[PDB]
Amino acid sequence: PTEFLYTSKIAAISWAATGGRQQRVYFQDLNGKIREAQRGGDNPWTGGSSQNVIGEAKLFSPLAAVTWKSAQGIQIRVYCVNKDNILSEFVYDGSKWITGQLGSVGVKVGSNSKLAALQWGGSESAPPNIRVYYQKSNLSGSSIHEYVWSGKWTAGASFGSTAPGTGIGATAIGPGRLRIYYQATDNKIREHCWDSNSWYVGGFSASASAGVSIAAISWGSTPNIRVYWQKGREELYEAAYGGSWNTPGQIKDASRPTPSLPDTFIAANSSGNIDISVFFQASGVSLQQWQWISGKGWSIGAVVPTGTPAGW
Amino acid sequence: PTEFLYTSKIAAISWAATGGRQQRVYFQDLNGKIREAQRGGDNPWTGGSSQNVIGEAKLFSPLAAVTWKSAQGIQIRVYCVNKDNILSEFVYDGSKWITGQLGSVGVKVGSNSKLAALQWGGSESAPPNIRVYYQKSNLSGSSIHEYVWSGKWTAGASFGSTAPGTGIGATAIGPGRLRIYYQATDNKIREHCWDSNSWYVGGFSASASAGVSIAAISWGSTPNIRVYWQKGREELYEAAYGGSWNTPGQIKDASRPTPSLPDTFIAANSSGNIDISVFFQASGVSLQQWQWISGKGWSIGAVVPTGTPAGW
Ligand SMILES: C[C@@H]1O[C@@H](O)[C@@H](O)[C@H](O)[C@@H]1O
Ligand SMILES: C[C@@H]1O[C@@H](O)[C@@H](O)[C@H](O)[C@@H]1O
Ligand SMILES: C[C@@H]1O[C@@H](O)[C@@H](O)[C@H](O)[C@@H]1O
Ligand SMILES: C[C@@H]1O[C@H](O)[C@@H](O)[C@H](O)[C@@H]1O
Ligand SMILES: C[C@@H]1O[C@H](O)[C@@H](O)[C@H](O)[C@@H]1O
Ligand SMILES: C[C@@H]1O[C@H](O)[C@@H](O)[C@H](O)[C@@H]1O
Ligand SMILES: C[C@@H]1O[C@H](O)[C@@H](O)[C@H](O)[C@@H]1O
Ligand SMILES: C[C@@H]1O[C@H](O)[C@@H](O)[C@H](O)[C@@H]1O
Ligand SMILES: C[C@@H]1O[C@H](O)[C@@H](O)[C@H](O)[C@@H]1O
Numbered sequence: 108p109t110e111f112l113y114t115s116k117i118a119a120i121s122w123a124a125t126g127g128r129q130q131r132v133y134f135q136d137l138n139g140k141i142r143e144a145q146r147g148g149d150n151p152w153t154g155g156s157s158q159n160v161i162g163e164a165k166l167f168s169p170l171a172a173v174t175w176k177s178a179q180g181i182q183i184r185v186y187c188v189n190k191d192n193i194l195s196e197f198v199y200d201g202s203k204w205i206t207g208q209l210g211s212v213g214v215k216v217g218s219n220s221k222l223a224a225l226q227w228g229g230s231e232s233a234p235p236n237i238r239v240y241y242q243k244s245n246l247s248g249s250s251i252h253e254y255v256w257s258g259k260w261t262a263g264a265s266f267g268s269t270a271p272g273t274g275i276g277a278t279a280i281g282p283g284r285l286r287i288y289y290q291a292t293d294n295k296i297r298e299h300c301w302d303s304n305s306w307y308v309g310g311f312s313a314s315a316s317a318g319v320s321i322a323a324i325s326w327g328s329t330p331n332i333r334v335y336w337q338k339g340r341e342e343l344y345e346a347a348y349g350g351s352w353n354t355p356g357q358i359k360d361a362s363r364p365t366p367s368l369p370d371t372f373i374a375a376n377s378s379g380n381i382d383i384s385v386f387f388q389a390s391g392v393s394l395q396q397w398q399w400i401s402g403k404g405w406s407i408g409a410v411v412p413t414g415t416p417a418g419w
Numbered sequence: 420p421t422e423f424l425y426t427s428k429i430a431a432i433s434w435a436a437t438g439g440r441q442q443r444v445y446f447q448d449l450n451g452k453i454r455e456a457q458r459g460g461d462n463p464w465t466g467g468s469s470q471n472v473i474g475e476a477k478l479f480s481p482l483a484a485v486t487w488k489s490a491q492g493i494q495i496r497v498y499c500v501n502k503d504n505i506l507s508e509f510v511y512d513g514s515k516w517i518t519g520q521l522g523s524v525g526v527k528v529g530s531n532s533k534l535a536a537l538q539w540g541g542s543e544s545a546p547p548n549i550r551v552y553y554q555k556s557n558l559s560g561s562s563i564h565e566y567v568w569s570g571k572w573t574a575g576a577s578f579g580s581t582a583p584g585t586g587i588g589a590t591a592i593g594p595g596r597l598r599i600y601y602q603a604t605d606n607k608i609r610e611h612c613w614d615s616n617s618w619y620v621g622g623f624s625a626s627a628s629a630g631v632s633i634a635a636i637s638w639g640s641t642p643n644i645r646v647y648w649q650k651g652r653e654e655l656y657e658a659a660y661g662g663s664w665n666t667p668g669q670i671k672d673a674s675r676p677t678p679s680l681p682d683t684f685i686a687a688n689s690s691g692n693i694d695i696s697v698f699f700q701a702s703g704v705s706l707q708q709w710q711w712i713s714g715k716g717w718s719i720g721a722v723v724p725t726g727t728p729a730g731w
């Protein structure tokens with residue numbers, strides 16, 4: 108056994124670095140703490156233990172994370188929900204983990220809401236633009252809401268009509284160019300887009316099992332988009348855009364069918380051109396991943412440590 | 420979601436009472452506490468909350484329980500393993516929960532050992548005779564060991580050669596007449612017997628999936644034995660003895676196939692003539708039970724509450 112909370116949500120980030128790509132993955136432990144595990148290049152995963160707590164949230168809190176580089180180092184933001192269902196934020200400010208300012212706004216979320224977040228523009232010489240996506244209601248047909256950071260937090264848009272407690276994936280495919288993926292009331296994955304001055308319904312859609320967990324990534328100038336969804340104990344699916352949308356396909360290992368446990372979640376990260384990780388929760392209870400190795404294909408990578416309870 | 424630890428072991432007891440059957444079920448929460456839920460007759464289950472803690476054990480501790488009536492009320496003993504893999508006991512003494520004497524003995528238990536217990540003889544006018552079954556090693560081919568209460572704790576027998584971390588069911592089919600069920604290295608359920616002065620290999624055997632959880636009950640003068648096994652996300656099996664063994668069969672609901680989650684455990688109780696519950700862990704994470712209802716048959720009964728975390 109491990110200290111990984113069964114049906115914990117997961118969030119993950121990645122950035123390229125001279126010694127090998129840096130990854131961080133966030134997950135909840137049995138005590139409600141949010142833990143971090145770390146990977147540098149292809150070196151074994153580290154962290155994931157009681158010594159790697161970055162914050163706390165309500166048990167079974169949704170999670171989302173973004174990162175950028177600033178003049179003060181690596182910035183990370185981890186979004187979660189407290190025990191009063193207030194949207195909250197933990198900040199890695201380049202040196203330490205602290206509580207961010209979002210919590211003080213007092214944004215109320217639906218108890219079963221998922222979370223997604225994206226960022227663009229932040230650098231050594233430019234401020235970040237963050238968008239956090241959540242829902243206020245657990246009911247079927249509810250909208251997705253957006254919180255906006257540009258120098259301060261303000262309410263953003265609301266759109267869509269979703270499956271109850273829909274999964275949400277969010278990616279900035281270019282500067283101020285946003286794609287949000289969610290499950291509609293008819294269980295289709297749908298796409299909401301912002302290019303310049305308005306939200307509009309995108310051309311992407313895909314039938315999926317009710318209650319899938321959804322992630323989305325993008326890279327490059329093409330741009331390239333990947334949308335992932337998975338129902339626990341079913342296989343992972345990927346839709347790919349590089350100018351058109353393909354027919355979605357399963358990512359799977361014939362020797363290890365349907366490795367995720369029921370009612371679990373996924374997260375994705377990416378960096379370079381291109382490395383991708385798609386995290387999932389399996390027997391153990393283990394934090395696993397699918398990895399795309401750029402010229403080899405998909406495989407299940409090294410298991411991410413998530414603690415070992417006393418007496419084991 | 421609930422506060423029921425996923426892959427918690429379970430233990431259950433039952434007795435006849437005026438007003439109807441009394442049942443108690445024991446399970447672990449996310450904090451490693453052992454909680455109790457209660458049922459009287461066919462009224463709703465009660466308990467299962469943070470206010471119903473009876474003890475604590477290592478996370479993912481195995482569990483077993485026995486009960487009898489005494490002059491000072493209902494006696495319950497719950498067996499578990501502490502964080503140092505020492506066999507430990509919680510006592511309901513007719514009025515309150517306290518720590519029992521067994522822990523002071525220092526009986527070391529394999530980290531992945533299961534536990535079973537049986538009792539006979541205890542009454543308002545006679546002392547209990549308790550037997551606890553456990554393993555010292557996790558390895559395939561290990562024996563089952565026995566601890567004995569006869570007014571004090573002493574080491575009893577060891578026997579068998581088991582599947583690694585086998586399930587164990589234990590039942591007293593008559594006064595001082597014991598039947599122990601476990602999974603052997605060929606994955607057959609097998610039976611060890613004590614009638615008078617020695618342990619011997621019983622006639623019962625049955626093929627089963629690798630790594631099943633096992634429980635056993637008995638009643639009456641025939642006597643009647645029921646042995647249960649289940650691999651998580653497969654159906655429950657029952658073998659039945661009424662003078663001879665039947666062909667084991669599934670207990671299942673065609674409208675709710677394989678309701679248990681992977682890698683989970685069962686427990687069984689019985690009392691009267693004849694009431695039986697077989698507990699299992701399902702999505703929720705919920706504590707469920709199969710119920711044997713005379714003249715109706717088997718069905719999934721009312722859900723047992725196991726807490727609701729803050730924010731839900
Ligand atoms: C980019 C901003 O950084 C800090 O000021 C946080 O307190 C804010 O909530 C936001 O994440
Ligand atoms: C990048 C593309 O932008 C719009 O054309 C959408 O309709 C597509 O689905 C895709 O997101
Ligand atoms: C009550 C019966 O006792 C012995 O005959 C065993 O061999 C049987 O399997 C059964 O347990
Ligand atoms: C960017 C920082 O990397 C360091 O290695 C980690 O210890 C911090 O938690 C954070 O992820
Ligand atoms: C990129 C756009 O920025 C704006 O401030 C928001 O109001 C829109 O919803 C969108 O996020
Ligand atoms: C990066 C790789 O892109 C390819 O075209 C896809 O087929 C793979 O699944 C993966 O997303
Ligand atoms: C026999 C006793 O029943 C009481 O109602 C319960 O509160 C105790 O925990 C115990 O099970
Ligand atoms: C029968 C005995 O009752 C006592 O209260 C316990 O302390 C012993 O361990 C044993 O269970
Ligand atoms: C009923 C028998 O009681 C004895 O004391 C023990 O030595 C045996 O193993 C068995 O439990």
Ligand SMILES: C[C@@H]1O[C@H](O)[C@@H](O)[C@H](O)[C@@H]1O
Nearest residue numbers: 645657659693695711717
């Ligand atoms: C008590 C009942 O006995 C019958 O003989 C069996 O068929 C049922 O499964 C159940 O155990």
